[PDB]
Amino acid sequence: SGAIYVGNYRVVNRHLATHNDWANLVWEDSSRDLLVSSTTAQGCDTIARCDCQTGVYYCSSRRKHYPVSFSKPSLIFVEASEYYPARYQSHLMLAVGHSEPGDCGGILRCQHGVVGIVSTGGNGLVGFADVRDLLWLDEE
């Protein structure tokens, strides 16, 4: 689990979105595994606006943060999970690292702020759903 809190937006994995999230939906994209919902309070997080390929991610299944190098957001043929079938998951970044379902929502961060959240795993890779292209998260 885990979320990003930027202004009056809450950013979660679409597959972990709550009823409250769907009842307060701002935007969702199955292809990206992202959902954003409205919030009443303001949030602690700044979104990275950058093309960094190095950062640090939180892995709940290790209670550890790991420094990683990661690929630029791509369309990545992700194998079936319990939430999605095998297709092109878009805006996905891959790194060599451990990942489990309960790790989805872990933050990846660079010097410019939050880059994305854990979305995929398996075979010694971790995939992150990028949020740095969602410029609208910074206003209104």
Ligand X SMILES: COc1ccccc1NC(N)=S
Compute the C-alpha angle 135/137/138, nearest 5°. Answer: 75
Q: Is residue 5 part of the contact set for ligand X (CB under 6 A)? A: no
Q: Is residue 52 part of the contact set for Zn ion (CB under 5 A)? A: yes
Q: Is 29 a catalytic residue?
A: no
Q: Is residue 48 part of the contact set for Zn ion (CB under 5 A)? A: yes
Quick one: tokens of 21? 């999230």
Quick one: tokens of 32? 């990206």
Pairing of strands 25-29, 34-38: antiparallel
**In the β-sheet with 4-6, what is the strand arrangement from edge to edge?**
4-6, 9-13, 34-38, 25-29
| CB-nearer residue toward Zn ion: 23 or 44 | 44
Q: Select the span of 7-15, 16-24, 76-84, 109-117 touching Zn ion (CB under 5 A).
A: 109-117
Taking the complex as a whole, how short is the minimal distance between the CB of residue 100 and Zn ion, in angstroms? 26
Among 41, 44, 85, 111, binds ligand X (CB under 6 A): 111
Half-sphere exposure of 119 (CA within 13 A, CB side): 33
Q: Residues annotated in the binding site for Zn(2+), as ranges? A: 50, 52, 110, 112
Tell me which residues are annotated as active site.
15, 33, 104
